[PDB]
Amino acid sequence: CQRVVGWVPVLFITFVVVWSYYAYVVELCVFTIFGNEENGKTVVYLVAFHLFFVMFVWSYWMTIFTSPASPSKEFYLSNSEKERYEKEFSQERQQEILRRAARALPIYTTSASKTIRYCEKCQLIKPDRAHHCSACDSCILKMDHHSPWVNNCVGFSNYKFFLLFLLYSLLYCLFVAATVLEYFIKFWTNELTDTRAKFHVLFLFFVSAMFFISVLSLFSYHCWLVGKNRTTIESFRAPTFSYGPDGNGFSLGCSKNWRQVFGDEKKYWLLPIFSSLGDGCSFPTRL
Amino acid sequence: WRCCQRVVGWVPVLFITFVVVWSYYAYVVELCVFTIFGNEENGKTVVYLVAFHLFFVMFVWSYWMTIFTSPASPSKEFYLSNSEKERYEKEFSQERQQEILRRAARALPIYTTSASKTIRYCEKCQLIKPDRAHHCSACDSCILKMDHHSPWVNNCVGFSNYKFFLLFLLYSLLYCLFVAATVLEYFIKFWTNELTDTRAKFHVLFLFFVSAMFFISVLSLFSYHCWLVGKNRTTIESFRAPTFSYGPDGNGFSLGCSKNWRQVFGDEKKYWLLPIFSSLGDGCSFPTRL
Numbered sequence: 001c002q003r004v005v006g007w008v009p010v011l012f013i014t015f016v017v018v019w020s021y022y023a024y025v026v027e028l029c030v031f032t033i034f035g036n037e038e039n040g041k042t043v044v045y046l047v048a049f050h051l052f053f054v055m056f057v058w059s060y061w062m063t064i065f066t067s068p069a070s071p072s073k074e075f076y077l078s079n080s081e082k083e084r085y086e087k088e089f090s091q092e093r094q095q096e097i098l099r100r101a102a103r104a105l106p107i108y109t110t111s112a113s114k115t116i117r118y119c120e121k122c123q124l125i126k127p128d129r130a131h132h133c134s135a136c137d138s139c140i141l142k143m144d145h146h147s148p149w150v151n152n153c154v155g156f157s158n159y160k161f162f163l164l165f166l167l168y169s170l171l172y173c174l175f176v177a178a179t180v181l182e183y184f185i186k187f188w189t190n191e192l193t194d195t196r197a198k199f200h201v202l203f204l205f206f207v208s209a210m211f212f213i214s215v216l217s218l219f220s221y222h223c224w225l226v227g228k229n230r231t232t233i234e235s236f237r238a239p240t241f242s243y244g245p246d247g248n249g250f251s252l253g254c255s256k257n258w259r260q261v262f263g264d265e266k267k268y269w270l271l272p273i274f275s276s277l278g279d280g281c282s283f284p285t286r287l
Numbered sequence: 288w289r290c291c292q293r294v295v296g297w298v299p300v301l302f303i304t305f306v307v308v309w310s311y312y313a314y315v316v317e318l319c320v321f322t323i324f325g326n327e328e329n330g331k332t333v334v335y336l337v338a339f340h341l342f343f344v345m346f347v348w349s350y351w352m353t354i355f356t357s358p359a360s361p362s363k364e365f366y367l368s369n370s371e372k373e374r375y376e377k378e379f380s381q382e383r384q385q386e387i388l389r390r391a392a393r394a395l396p397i398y399t400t401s402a403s404k405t406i407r408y409c410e411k412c413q414l415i416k417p418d419r420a421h422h423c424s425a426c427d428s429c430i431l432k433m434d435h436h437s438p439w440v441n442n443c444v445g446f447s448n449y450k451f452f453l454l455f456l457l458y459s460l461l462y463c464l465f466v467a468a469t470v471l472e473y474f475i476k477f478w479t480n481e482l483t484d485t486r487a488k489f490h491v492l493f494l495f496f497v498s499a500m501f502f503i504s505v506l507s508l509f510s511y512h513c514w515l516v517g518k519n520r521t522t523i524e525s526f527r528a529p530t531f532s533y534g535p536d537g538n539g540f541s542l543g544c545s546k547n548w549r550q551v552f553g554d555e556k557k558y559w560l561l562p563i564f565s566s567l568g569d570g571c572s573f574p575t576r577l
């Protein structure tokens with residue numbers, strides 16, 4: 001169905017994280033770190049590791065199973081407008097049917113040719129920052145991009161969950177890499193030579209370091225998108241307003257831009273609980 | 288104030304500087320002297336050390352040039368004089384203040400407008416943007432034939448830097464390709480324990496990975512600009528085709544594949560692979576297809 005093959009990237013990430021939990025706790029902390037009796041380190045890593053581990057898997061879970069938000073029923077063509085639009089043959093006259101409907105909706109953007117943004121498949125008038133996804137077969141409010149590593153679209157409901165998933169990916173990889181670093185050296189100078197545990201300790205430092213540098217660019221890109229209040233699509237095709245194209249049409253200042261996604265309640269900023277302001281169908285404009 | 292912000296822009300170049308200085312120490316001292324030369328192969332050592340230095344000097348020369356070549360800014364002809372800028376600041380009508388820019392544009396070689404048929408004007412610099420020129424908020428200036436603000440060089444890629452930036456990507460691939468190709472033979476052996484220099488293990492293995500990660504990364508970045516040069520498009524223009532008097536046209540500056548490359552590298556073949564300024568034009572006006 002193509003759905004099944006879509007669950008392959010998440011199974012890979014699941015096994016790599018499951019392997020990292022067994023490798024970091026069993027092979028590294030119990031066999032290696034506890035094997036040389038260094039006072040006060042085995043416990044302080046296990047409590048900190050579990051703390052990073054739960055935040056990583058909880059944010060990753062939310063990004064996967066948080067269904068993407070769709071436009072409300074107000075943006076769908078009524079039976080009167082959907083009929084006349086389907087039967088109208090002149091492209092000029094069918095545009096007026098969409099334009100009159102757009103006056104009753106909070107729509108401030110148009111196509112590149114000054115055309116009312118309309119989705120022929122869903123038979124609805126696309127709201128601002130909303131785009132149709134051929135994988136999800138639905139319009140996604142404030143669609144950022146379809147992330148294949150979570151088998152879901154990153155939209156208005158997912159965005160803050162996706163960003164935290166990146167951040168906790170960085171800290172989980174940074175913590176593992178920085179803590180395994182001191183013991184990755186000892187197996188090479190041959191202070192330790194455990195045949196049963198050497199192989200697991202090495203990959204931890206390489207897999208965590210190769211994933212750290214990978215998502216780090218992905219994390220820096222979105223820190224710059226959020227400050228500018230742009231989605232991944234808007235960075236490549238800026239939305240067109242009445243006064244022309246403007247890639248900063250939705251910007252409200254770097255401080256207020258972040259709060260549009262994270263909210264004003266500070267107790268939900270770092271937790272993967274929906275705290276994004278607004279409804280996803282309409283967004284404050286700069287002008 | 289800005290001591291924290293302006294200095295943090297130099298962090299990406301100091302990171303690459305340390306990676307390169309280390310790669311020089313890792314390839315010459317640890318690999319060629321300690322690893323390769325300890326293995327009774329003085330023929331491969333000297334041929335590598337000179338081949339490495341040839342790529343190393345071309346790599347750092349292009350890198351330095353893309354950094355310290357300041358981007359081109361508009362000339363005083365495009366600035367609004369104190370007479371024209373006075374009447375514009377006082378005007379409140381949108382079309383009447385636009386008429387001010389229209390008569391001024393009849394004296395400038397400008398063939399592009401905005402997507403909404405408006406004269407490209409810059410409120411911060413108080414000038415009329417030349418063609419292909421754009422304003423950079425990081426540089427706080429207008430940049431002639433601006434491509435993109437590449438943070439890894441802490442500078443704008445514009446009309447004067449572009450060839451240096453392109454050669455900096457070319458020599459990065461070759462510097463990484465040469466290292467990846469040469470360290471490959473000795474990378475496999477250390478995993479089969481075929482050699483054991485406790486001190487050489489750390490540098491030789493990191494050499495292969497660091498050079499392999501950078502190669503595959505900049506390979507896409509290098510491939511994107513080779514298309515831009517052939518189409519005579521900047522990065523900004525690949526996102527939004529410019530609009531001329533006859534409408535939007537992504538190939539409005541295209542003069543053919545061969546003639547577009549010479550626009551950046553020049554007609555003198557001796558300057559093609561050298562990071563010395565050889566780009567055609569003045570940056571304020573460019574030949575159009577029509």
Ligand SMILES: CCCCCCCCCCCCCCCC(=O)SCCNC(=O)CCNC(=O)[C@H](O)C(C)(C)COP(=O)(O)OP(=O)(O)OC[C@H]1O[C@@H](n2cnc3c(N)ncnc32)[C@H](O)[C@@H]1OP(=O)(O)O
Nearest residue numbers: 235236238247421422423424425435436439501504526527
């Ligand atoms: C072994 C040792 C080897 C070492 C070897 C080292 C190798 C070294 C590489 C290492 C690893 C890198 C490999 C991966 C690469 C990355 O990690 S980073 C990828 C970044 N790629 C880029 O191209 C940089 C783009 N960054 C920008 O800021 C661009 O200018 C953007 C995308 C256009 C956005 O700019 P901005 O946010 O608007 O900021 P600003 O400075 O104000 O620029 C504004 C101008 O852009 C224009 N603009 C903005 N948005 C748009 C748009 N959607 N459409 C058209 N125009 C736009 C504005 O209109 C404006 O122009 P005007 O019309 O006003 O005059």
Ligand SMILES: [Zn+2]
Nearest residue numbers: 119122132139
């Ligand atoms: Zn749709």
Ligand SMILES: [Zn+2]
Nearest residue numbers: 133136146153
């Ligand atoms: Zn999708």
Ligand SMILES: [Zn+2]
Nearest residue numbers: 409412422429
């Ligand atoms: Zn400017």
Ligand SMILES: [Zn+2]
Nearest residue numbers: 423426436443
């Ligand atoms: Zn710049």
